[PDB]
Amino acid sequence: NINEILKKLINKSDLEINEAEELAKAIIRGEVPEILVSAILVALRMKGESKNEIVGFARAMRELAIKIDVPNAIDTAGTGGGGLGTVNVSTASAILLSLVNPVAKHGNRAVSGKSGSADVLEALGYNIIVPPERAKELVNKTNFVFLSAQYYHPAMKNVANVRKTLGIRTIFNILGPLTNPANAKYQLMGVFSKDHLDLLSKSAYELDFNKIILVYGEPGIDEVSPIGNTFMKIVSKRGIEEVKLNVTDFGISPIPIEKLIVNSAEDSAIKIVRAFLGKDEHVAEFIKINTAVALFALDRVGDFREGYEYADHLIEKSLDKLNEIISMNGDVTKLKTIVVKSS
């Protein structure tokens, strides 16, 4: 009952998992008036969301999602929220990872005029209209697929207006990487705030991954830090392992954030492609350190340095892989224009 839940939230009592899941389902289904949805989303944030509430909302979104089944896939995706406007590094990293493992990403086009994963993929020529059966086929043939939230999380449209009108960030903004509709059992999860590492790692531990690594990077980004320390949690059935890593532990000097910042999807696309051509080493290094940790989550390397070395071999083959991905699901002529502009 929406009314007692709200009173409970107002009193700063944490919800149980099933309480939270039913709450999320009613909201996502559009069964709850906008006024009460706004009330609930604000109350959750001001109370401070608990593990049980994160797990419940995650399971609700997964259950209401349109699904495919690629449990052996990896995803590398973040919560967003840092807003530094840096290159779409997880998208580039997915391309390296697809050479050696199935990859399934998901998400939305960004608001204008930001650059999300969907937008950089589209600038590269990718067709984000991918029905489930096609998605299955695409992953089999090319080890990569992008699953648009519009199609795979279609019920999220029912909370869109409250979310937009509120402006502020809510529980929904930290659920993205925990709600992969391909059921990817391996996950590199970026989190924008150091204070959310603990909540989300503990939540992740009950969301049934084989291995999920949560990363927060200085100066405040949902990625492996190119400037300094990365604070990470390694979650498995064995438990949660604390890890602190500096960029120097990859064998490289700190990358200046200036070099990673982008001003459009195309610019992000150009940066990525130049890194694949060996013409932008700062972005390549950023891509590679993020891939290195993803490789570690897959249990393909024994440490992060080896992952970084191994990513170097993958980046050299990535433009060719990008071409095969886009030729199978997209317009190769858009990739070639980006390549010309990258040369």
Ligand X SMILES: O=P(O)(O)OC[C@H]1O[C@H](OP(=O)(O)OP(=O)(O)O)[C@H](O)[C@@H]1O
Which residues are at the interface with ligand X (CB under 6 A)?
77-80, 88-91, 105, 107-108, 116-117, 173, 176, 190
* Closer Cβ to a copy of itself, 162 or 212, answer by number: 162
* Closer Cβ to a copy of itself, 12 or 341, answer by number: 12
Is 28 within 8 Å of 155 (Cβ atoms)?
A: yes
**Contact mark string toward a copy of itself, 1..40, x via CB under 8 A:** --x--xx--x-x--------------------xxxx-xx-
Q: How far apart are CA 338 and CA 343, in angstroms?
A: 9
# binding residues, a copy of itself (CB under 8 A): 22
Is 343 within 8 Å of 301 (Cβ atoms)?
A: no
177 is a site residue for Mn ion (CB under 5 A): no
Q: How far is the CB of 173 from a copy of itself (least distance, A)?
A: 13
* Closer Cβ to a copy of itself, 168 or 340, answer by number: 168
* Closer Cβ to a copy of itself, 45 or 317, answer by number: 45
Q: How far apart are CA 172 and CA 78, in angstroms?
A: 13
Is 37 within 8 Å of 76 (Cβ atoms)?
A: no
* Closer Cβ to ligand X, 18 or 112, answer by number: 112
**Interacting residues of 104 by C-beta distance below 8 A, sequence separation 6+:** 68, 70, 73, 74, 75, 139, 144, 145, 147, 180, 182, 184
Token pair listed for 336: 């070639």
Token pair listed for 174: 């930290």
Q: Which stretch binds Mn ion (CB under 5 A): 35-43, 73-81, 268-276, 278-286?
A: 73-81
* Closer Cβ to ligand X, 14 or 66, answer by number: 66
Query: Among 52, 90, 142, 203, which residue interacts with Mn ion (rule: CB under 5 A)?
Result: 90
Q: How far is the CB of 63 from ligand X (least distance, A)?
A: 20
Which residues of the chain form beta strands (DSSP E)?
74-78, 103-107, 144-148, 186-190, 211-217, 229-236, 239-246
**Interacting residues of 63 by C-beta distance below 8 A, sequence separation 6+:** 21, 25
Residues near a copy of itself (CB under 8 A): 3, 6-7, 10, 12, 33-36, 38-39, 42-43, 45-47, 161-162, 165-168
